[PDB]
Design a protein around this ligand. Structure first.
Ligand SMILES: c1ccc(-c2cnc[nH]2)cc1
Ligand SMILES: c1ccc(-c2cnc[nH]2)cc1
Ligand SMILES: c1ccc(-c2cnc[nH]2)cc1
Ligand SMILES: c1ccc(-c2cnc[nH]2)cc1
Ligand SMILES: [Cl-]
Ligand SMILES: [Cl-]
Ligand SMILES: [Mg+2]
Ligand SMILES: [Mg+2]
Lengths: 396, 396
């Protein structure tokens, strides 16, 4: 172990190259400092930093043994005294997810040039999904203080090209996420429950219009919920179970929750909706925490009011904190997914706030935006790949 | 998107290749199915599966545009209608850690040939540490039912070549480990506390001899603890604090625990030793769970007995289970690290049982064995790299 030598083997993948190389090196006094190898589309690259006696490195036996063995079977090898080279690359600082249906070449090219223009190095690119959407990951090394610019640059690329682009800190701490909360309406569940209750009153049109104004930040949430629930005054309480049994999970929601249990996440829901509807489901979904509002009932009939206190925008953040404290999870390790301005405060306080098919008020504040109608695209933003989900699911 | 074409770019890394390629492809009707890229020791490989109109794929414009752009600046590119190729590789089944000081070429070559002989494909090799030991990772794809043979083959390589070799399941579930327990004596802490107590009685020689016989499985643990603690009959109870203040953490133990808190592990200790000594420390180390034995004291003096019930070999497993149930962690997601036959049952029940500088009885039963005097080599077996630990620590 006097001097360091770098051996690099490239060419068309073949059986036995890795084994052949280290057997040859063992006829010389070689100890390993670092080995990197990958095969991409049958192209092999094998990089080996070793140290050996200055005697062997300075003489032609090591080189002739390596070169003859590698060249004989079809590949190429270079050999060079390094001494100055890094031993082992540093970790990426950040990771970038690109989700599209499709992802065009132009979309990806724009990301790559956006990245380059900021002096960001691409350390790795891989696929993470081929269904329900194409998903691609770039691990990168961002110059210090450039990552605000990078998110800004990539959000434009995202809108201009019709791909989701999420930039996420790739450090040990920030990526040990352990706790996720979903908004219910238009996030975990298709549609808006309060609209399904109002349909029982022939008020769906009015309620839906107030809901869209509320979910765009156009109306104060508390006022908007009182106006909407009022249209329910007089309906019998039986209507709750009825709507409860009508609900449909967002597509990919079961996969999302099941996969997140495999990873040991605490899972909960924070809703402006109604505990009597969400609890039946949270229990069916084996959740750990429910926060919701409560409908007032008199003589088995809805009064058109809710029983305070009301979970408003600020209250959803407050439930997240409460959930994180009870679970023993620092807030930087929490995930919130929602769709409306109702969720702005909850996404800001979460470690990672995901806007799922969201109104512009939310998209503008989220750490990340998803634009396709599959809730399991959340799994890709949490470092999970399609193939891994299918492996786990197939093993049962 | 009628047909699938595979573009593969290889050569010496340069600025702009990724960006150049996708800009060229955007002048044709190209959508992305999969992108893999890495640079190893300045050798770039970029593999791109796309789909485009059968018109563009069948004509020479796409090829001449790609070939001219890539060749102009120094690299090579191939282009081929695929249609039959996989879109996105499957995940590895297992991962192999090779720790050595040093790792010789012969050691690594033996691993590579052992792997090959069982029909195991190496999907990736990377470095995970350059200090305190050289650490290398191979992600592999093991034929179903071959992994018992693989562990067997690699354990021989390990002893024959003086490297630790750990084979670990690389599935989503089994690698979301969330809970670790350490044995104390000769694991988290240097030396054997009961030997430090006996030194106060001039009994160290006898106690140490009984301890080594007990830690090799030669003696029943319960009998061996009674004989040893008896030599303490008559010492004043003050001797506990004294030894407490003398203790030295295993080297790298602070890094191990700190890094494991960053990842959100529940951390505890299970010891045959004495709660009055371990508690002062567990609290100093911010642990979540302590299990230990209790020294009997009369009139401020040790009687030479322990206050049952005694944590024996079976009792350490029982505390692990108890700890896992209280924390909400399935046993397949738990980690136990120990050194003596005292820990055999605890390592068997844990998801991953690590033998740290252990007696042969333990090594023979552990999922993994570490042979170097740094407890932070545990972090490498849990998927953490040296560079990541240093990044996190530098960020404070
Ligand atoms: C050094 C500089 C740039 C790159 C690179 C980034 N994207 C493709 N190659 C890789 C290493
Ligand atoms: C804002 C908009 C809709 C809702 C809701 C719909 N169903 C239950 N709550 C709650 C707040
Ligand atoms: C297919 C077959 C073998 C390999 C390989 C394993 N180790 C080095 N190359 C890679 C792909
Ligand atoms: C077996 C051997 C030693 C010990 C021990 C040493 N110090 C505290 N307990 C416990 C069991
Ligand atoms: Cl309710
Ligand atoms: Cl005690
Ligand atoms: Mg909603
Ligand atoms: Mg011990």
């Amino acid at each position: 172990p006097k001097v360091s030598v770098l051996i690099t083997v490239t060419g068309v993948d073949q059986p036995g190259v890795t084994a052949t190389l280290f057997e040859v090196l063992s006829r010389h006094g070689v100890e390993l400092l670092n080995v990197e190898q990958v095969v991409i589309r049958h192209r092999l690259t094998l990089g080996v930093l070793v140290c050996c006696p200055a005697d062997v490195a300075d003489g032609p036996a090591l080189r002739h043994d390596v070169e003859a063995a590698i060249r004989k079977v079809g590949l190429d090898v270079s050999i060079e005294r390094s001494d100055d080279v890094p031993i082992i690359r540093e970790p990426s600082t950040h990771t970038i997810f690109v989700l599209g249906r499709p992802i065009t070449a132009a979309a990806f090219g724009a990301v790559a040039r956006e990245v380059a223009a900021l002096g960001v190095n691409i350390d790795l690119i891989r696929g993470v999904s081929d269904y329900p959407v194409i998903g691609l990951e770039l691990r990168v090394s961002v110059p210090p203080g450039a990552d605000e610019a990078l998110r800004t640059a990539l959000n434009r690329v995202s809108s201009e090209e019709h791909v989701d682009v999420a930039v996420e800190d790739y450090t040990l701490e920030r990526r040990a996420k352990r706790l996720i909360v979903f908004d219910v309406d238009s996030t975990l569940v298709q549609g808006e429950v309060i609209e399904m209750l109002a349909a029982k009153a022939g008020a769906e049109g009015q309620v839906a219009a107030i809901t869209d104004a509320a979910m765009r930040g156009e109306l104060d949430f508390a006022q908007s919920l009182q106006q909407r629930v009022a249209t329910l005054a007089g309906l019998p309480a039986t209507v709750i179970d009825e709507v409860a049994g009508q609900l449909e999970l967002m597509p990919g929601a079961r996969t999302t929750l099941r996969t997140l249990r495999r990873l040991g996440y605490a899972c909960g829901v924070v809703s402006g909706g109604f505990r009597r509807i969400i609890e039946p489901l949270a229990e069916e979904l084996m959740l750990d925490y429910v926060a919701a509002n409560e409908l007032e009932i008199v003589d088995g009939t809805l009064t058109g009011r809710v029983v305070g206190p009301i979970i408003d925008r600020a209250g959803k953040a407050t439930a997240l904190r409460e959930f994180a404290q009870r679970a023993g999870v620092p807030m930087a390790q929490t995930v919130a997914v929602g769709d409306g301005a109702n969720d702005i405060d909850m996404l800001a306080a979460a470690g990672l706030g995901i806007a799922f098919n969201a109104k512009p008020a939310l998209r503008e504040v989220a750490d990340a935006s998803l634009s396709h109608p599959y809730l399991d695209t959340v799994l890709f933003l949490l470092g999970v790949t399609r193939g891994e989900i299918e492996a786990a699911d197939a093993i049962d």
